[PDB]
């Protein structure tokens, strides 16, 4: 055999409350847009913004 | 992930309305003035009594 694949699930958040005024998570599908030191555009659902 | 949500608290609530209190304030005003004046007069009538 040979192996070739990386695939992921996208069911929604095991949900948790914090009340910190910058924790943001998306109910239902959709992702965020973030830019690095070079502006490189990356995408994530992590909500720990500061 | 494959979720089922729990519960959380929607802040707090209070039993207050802003119109029944207005009536209350006006009534209090009228009543207080009338009370004080009457009882002063009652004092003077104490004087005239004997």
TrEMBL record, chain A:
UniProt-annotated location(s): Bacterial flagellum basal body
Q: What does this protein do?
A: A flexible structure which links the flagellar filament to the drive apparatus in the basal body.
Q: Which family does it belong to?
A: Belongs to the flagella basal body rod proteins family.
Q: What is this protein called?
A: Flagellar hook protein FlgE
